Write a protein that binds this ligand. Structure first.
Ligand SMILES: [K+]
Length: 235
């Protein structure tokens, strides 16, 4: 079977969310030195912002094909599924996500993009995957505080939810799903909340410190990864 047909068949299995079929087809390709077909499929999934690319990577990771994730995907997939300490860098502003020191009552610590620190232990996070009902979700754990990223129930006048770090994962407010995207050579992700299906963003409003508060944004983000998406960098 020609490579373009193998590409087609692999890509369709992922888009319909038959991950076991996608894993099986991938294993065959990778054994037969046709990593070009897998890489081409991943690149297409990302061009097309297909969320199912995350589940595909995760099932390869779980089903004994971590080598395929390492070798055929942007480095970010490795970083996510290996639970590497990473930095979450907002493409628009080049700021690292962090948590405040003081605890804002039952809300937890405030999440924000730090105006200055893009490098200390405060800006380290890890993604912790879980599978449910044919989807992969993530808890996003701050390394220093052992607190999880969450949206609060409250909203501003736009219907945006504030983001916080809290002690445990008690509800879908503390779980997230990812959608891949591209800007130039950089692979990015929209990061959506499971409870409210809003994208994690940084405020356009600057604090005098240069900090920007983090919010679950009530608005359109797709098509504008350079405004609303996140890079994942090795810490
Ligand atoms: K073959």
């Amino acid at each position: 079977v020609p490579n373009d047909i193998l590409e087609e068949q692999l890509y369709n299995s992922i888009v319909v969310a038959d991950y076991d079929s996608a894993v099986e087809k991938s294993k065959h390709l990778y054994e037969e030195k046709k990593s070009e077909v897998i890489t081409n499929v991943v690149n297409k999934l990302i061009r097309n912002n297909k969320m199912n690319c995350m589940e595909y990577a995760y099932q390869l990771w779980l089903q004994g094909s971590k080598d395929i994730v390492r070798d055929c995907f942007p480095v970010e997939f490795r970083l996510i599924f290996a639970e590497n300490a990473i930095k979450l860098m907002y493409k628009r502003d080049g700021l690292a996500l962090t948590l405040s020191n003081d605890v804002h009552g039952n809300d937890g610590r405030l999440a924000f993009g730090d105006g200055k620190d893009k490098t200390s232990p405060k800006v380290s996070w890890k993604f912790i995957a879980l599978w449910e009902n044919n989807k992969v979700y993530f808890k996003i754990l701050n390394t220093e505080r052992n607190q999880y990223l969450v949206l609060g129930v409250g909203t501003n006048p736009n219907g945006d939810h504030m983001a916080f770090g809290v002690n445990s994962v008690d509800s879908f407010r503390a779980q997230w799903y990812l959608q891949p995207a591209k800007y130039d050579k950089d692979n990015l992700f929209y990061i959506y909340n499971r409870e409210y299906s809003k994208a994690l963003t940084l405020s356009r409003t600057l604090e005098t410190s240069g900090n920007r508060m983090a919010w679950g944004y009530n608005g359109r983000v797709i098509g504008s990864p350079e405004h609303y998406a996140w890079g994942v960098k090795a810490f």
